[PDB]
Symmetry: D2
Subunit: 255 residues, 4 copies
């Protein structure tokens, strides 16, 4: 008797057992969801990781920059869940920005690197929704991972720009998803240890737990995974094109 009992949910973005998507997948399975997982590039390695989840789940290859992968995705998911069955949820937990656009001066990132980062981190949220909406049930839910990019910060540079673009994409995806009776939302998380940039990240994370009224544990992805599962559930049925902040309330406090 789980929060997601009988729901068929696709979860992308597992690379390690520290990945936010690994925790989202774990909590969803504990809550009765039947999963379909998608992995990028290191498929043999991802299968070794996903074996650590509480239940077996089919693993499909998905490189969001690969148009052929996107074109075959719905068909491959239908084969995995059975003809006549559709998805109730989709989790986008994919992000990438080359080291020139993260960590290196903001002005020194070449556009080919920024473009690749925006493709994977923002445009792919629209790509995945385009591919999967035709195989989603009414009352369904699409959830993506974000971080608050409303204010600039050290080091995250072009990845912050990519998140600003992702929040805008999310609002357009909601217009399309609504036609199917599906919601589209992002979860803006606090910093999670998933694996002078070092001094910047340290100062960011320190200021986090201090600014958060309920505190913030950077080593624990469970509160974020639970928030994603709340959006996948039937309990936020009138929320779409929106952002839910799972950050300990830090974005609501100046100091």
């Amino acid at each position: 008797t789980g929060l997601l009992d009988g729901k068929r949910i696709l979860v992308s973005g597992i690379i390690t057992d520290s990945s936010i998507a690994f925790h989202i997948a774990r909590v969803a399975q504990e809550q009765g969801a039947q999963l379909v997982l998608t992995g990028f590039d290191r498929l043999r390695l991802i299968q070794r990781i996903t074996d650590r989840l509480p239940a077996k789940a089919p693993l499909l290859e998905l490189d969001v920059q690969n148009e052929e992968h996107l074109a075959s995705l719905a068909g491959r998911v239908t084969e995995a869940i059975g003809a006549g069955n559709k998805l109730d949820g989709v989790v986008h937990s994919i992000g990438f920005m080359p080291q020139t656009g993260m960590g290196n001066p903001f002005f020194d990132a070449p556009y080919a690197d920024v473009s690749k980062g925006i493709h994977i981190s923002a445009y792919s949220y629209a790509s995945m929704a385009k591919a999967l909406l035709p195989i989603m049930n009414p009352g369904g839910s699409i959830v993506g991972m974000d971080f608050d990019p409303s204010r600039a910060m050290p080091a995250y540079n072009w990845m912050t720009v990519a998140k600003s673009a992702l929040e805008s994409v999310n609002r357009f995806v909601a217009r399309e998803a609504g036609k199917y009776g599906v919601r589209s939302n992002l979860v803006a998380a606090g910093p999670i240890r998933t694996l002078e940039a070092g001094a910047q990240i340290q100062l960011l994370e320190e200021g986090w737990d201090q600014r958060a009224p309920i505190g913030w544990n950077m080593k624990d992805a469970t509160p974020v995974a639970k928030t994603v599962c709340a959006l996948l559930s039937d309990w936020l049925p009138a929320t779409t094109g929106d952002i839910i902040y799972a950050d300990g309330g830090a974005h609501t406090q100046l100091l």
Copy 2:
């Protein structure tokens, strides 16, 4: 096997069976919560309304402008739930603005005594209720208030919109205090619910909402409040969850 099984939750704001608080109370009981209800002034009238709920719940008097009611509130709740027991949730679904400050009356013609009363009941009372009830709340607890998006001005709602802007700010400070108790504080910003300026506001809502908006149905709002009362949004505080069909995310 409900979302709020074994949770003790206080729900204020029931006046009719169309009140948002009535639907929040109904959904919370369906989800296994044990409720304590608070009402204002017409307690006999409110008691008859609460008989329509699926389960019996004690009804306590609470006029948020009455300091004596606030001073005795925790003691009265403790008598209702039993000594040694604490609340897991609190729902503030209280609002009021006199006709001079909300409606057809020019924005400039509302006297301050009316605006002040409206702000007292609609915004300051969210702090008053948290002050009174935080000493009797469990860690992991949740305080939820009802709001509407006041980030842009609109016809008619005038000073009530100002009171909601003040309420959003109050919620952010209540979160700082509530965090000391391991308690979250959040608001649910709802679309218009039936509980021709208002008709035009509603039409534009269902049009802007990507998933549409049914003004006659408080259930999606009640479900959202229950999601915040649950253990499923444990890292959200001082925040606003929009149960408005996504209308605030679309220009047109």
Copy 3:
């Protein structure tokens, strides 16, 4: 000058460190003809306004006094001359008792104190606009002083709530002011100095100030009201003609940076 020939009312001078004193000074240097309003200590205020570069009539205005508001337009008209109207209005008024802003716990502020603070700090922006819009020229401008209340912070407590209410009042005043061809905007300033709190609150406030200069990409000088006064004068001018119901941030860009 930027404000050559403009008739502008400026409220909120109490000392020569008041933001309104600097706004009045910059406005006069820019050719504006002022009318000043003061509260309670009129003899004291008169001595302060003698430190401004030009003489300006001083009118009494307690924003909690309805008789003062009812007679304001008539008293301004007598000061500027019959047939003349105001081109600008500056609201630089704020008040919150020590129970609502300072060391006192957020929960311990009684409503009579919060209500007085909201009356003076937020509601009076609407009161002043109601009183003065009938004597304002098309192309006119109303400007109020604010601080960013979108996130909670230590100590400012109910004054932060009052500023959240003021931002909302500003959006409604813009709807009314537009009927007269008049703009309404707020300037959100960084902290300006315009042991007493004890070691604990004193350290919290010091961190708030230091953090501001650190976050501001162009820095922030807490001793200097001039960049704020210049911003208010930009809004009083004809150079932001399509901005209304809005907030302009004169804070060194601090609100645009997380750290």
Copy 4:
């Protein structure tokens, strides 16, 4: 004049209806000395309509060689020993697959990427190239529109503006090191073939704007926008950076 003696670079003139043409005109009326940049294949015939002579330099923001030589070419135009006091970015582009009648999901990434390169990334490119030749107290201004809420038709151009707002906040961090401000002006729609359906959607967007704006909005008039940009280029908003000034008649502050 508001900009007496200031040396200001203005990019983005293509026609005499371009917002940059009006910004350039108002800047010259206010005493500025301009350097203009353009990219097309005869902009000089258009820039000749301005009240004063101004050197015109070629700048394709997707061209790394043009960006690498820009500061040197500007220095040659304004004279050795002189620096810029202002920079105006009034450049935007989104192919018809990403903005217009095309479904949001049907825009291919190569088209969106080109749109983002020109409309958002180039704001950082121009600041990188010109900050080394800017005076303290200088100002960089870019053109934007409010992308906080989704809307019909503008689709990927709205996404590009969301990215541009974020870029501006990072440019402000870099510009601050030089004592230079970086801000955007978010304008309402300006009139600078779609069919009945999209034509009606755009008409509703326009009508809605003038009705929401407490002071109204004249879509045929770029002058209020040009004036706002000149206010940011001036010394009168000295403590504003990484920010957005709305020259939209106050429409963004009103729901209805």
